[PDB]
Amino acid sequence: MKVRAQVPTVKNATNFNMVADSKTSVGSTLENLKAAIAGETGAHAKYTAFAKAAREQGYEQIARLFEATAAAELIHIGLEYALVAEMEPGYEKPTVAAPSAYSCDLNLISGANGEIYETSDMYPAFIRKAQEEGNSKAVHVFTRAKLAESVHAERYLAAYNDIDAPDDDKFHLCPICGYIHKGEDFEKCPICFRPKDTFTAY
Amino acid sequence: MKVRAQVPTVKNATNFNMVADSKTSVGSTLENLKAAIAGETGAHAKYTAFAKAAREQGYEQIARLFEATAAAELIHIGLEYALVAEMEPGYEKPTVPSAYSCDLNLISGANGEIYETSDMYPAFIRKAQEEGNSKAVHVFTRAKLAESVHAERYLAAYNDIDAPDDDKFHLCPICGYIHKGEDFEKCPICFRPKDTFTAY
Ligand SMILES: [Fe+2]
Ligand SMILES: [Fe+2]
Ligand SMILES: [Fe+3]
Ligand SMILES: [Fe+3]
Ligand SMILES: [Fe+3]
Ligand SMILES: [Fe+3]
Secondary structure, three states, X not given: OOOOOOOOXXXXXXXXXXXXXXXXXXXXXXXXXXXXXXXXXXXXHHHHHHHHHHHHOOOHHHHHHHHHHHHHHHHHHHXXXXXXXXHOOOOOOOOOOOOOOOOHHHHHHHHHHHHHHHHHHHHHHHHHHHHHOOOHHHHHHHHHHHHHHHHHHHXXXXXXXXXXXXXXXXXXXXXXXXXXXXXXXXXXXOOOOOEHHHOEEO | OOOOXXXXXXXXXXXXXXXXXXOXXXXXXXXXXXXXXXXXXXXXXXXXXXXXXXXXXXXXXXXXXXXXXXXXXXXXXXXXXXXXXXXXXXXXXXXXXXXXXXXXXXXXXXXXXXXXXXXXXHHHHHHHHHHOOHHHHHHHHHHHHHHHHHHHXXXXXXXXXXXXXXXXXXEOOOOXXXXXXXOOOEOOOXXXXXXXXXXX
């Protein structure tokens, strides 16, 4: 993902449309924030399981990608949770059980599909609802998450394509959004503009 | 996709597992070849329609990617048709889509590619192996490998939908491999030299 003159927003970007045949139940923005947190909690458990399996299967680099992405989802949860907490102090983040991890290639596909669903269906749906309800804070949070998900999708497909050709590149995760970059060739986050030296390496 | 020391095959690669919850009806290799052709014919019509829409939507480069991928599916059809014609002389290829916003079309493309690379082709490859049809295994393998590359190209285009560049997309002459830009030497799927590619 290239760095543009300004950070991507639903106002200056053109990949924010929701698939017409959406598989996402949309409620109030508060409900959607909670729904997103639930989905991300599941994603985190999935990627964590996928990472462990990857290591056992001998895919050290892919395991690191799964771990970096799991961490990215935790950032999304943090962003979403912060908004929910302001509106409902008693709200507690949910916990889920760990799902099964299968062959690494299939796990990468599972990851890619989930990411695609989130970036082109769920988040766009939640963003639209937030826009229609005038909840700019939610639009911001959902937009940030949405943008990282499509990057995750690409990273998973790239790993899948080179499943038998890994390298020693580290994955760098942005400190405040889910953007992940493979290798050192980047300057700042294309999603939020945080400098490269603020990233965490996986 | 990186160029390995060896040409990727179902024998030396580890991304040929098929999804457990398959959406692919599997029959004889002959039927599967025809099914693949029908699917690719749909894909070609889809991408051609997406390219047209992309140009109307003002995304010239993405239009070119759609055109390149459509051409890739045509290559797949050619490989599969050749085998079918041999297994059934006289066979006639079938004829067949709605287009939406460019970003959605890229996602639709990506999803179709993922289905083909992780579901359809792997299933057909295994059935071909079971029946001992080596030609089909080779053809299905070649197609399968290109589809995952297409998926990545579509997601890459989606991520930089508002940040196009002047890169041309290069299509391999005998397989569906597509490379964006000039930084490549040969096809990682079949090893064909860069000078034999066609630019889009
Ligand atoms: Fe994600
Ligand atoms: Fe394809
Ligand atoms: Fe997510
Ligand atoms: Fe960031
Ligand atoms: Fe295809
Ligand atoms: Fe090739």
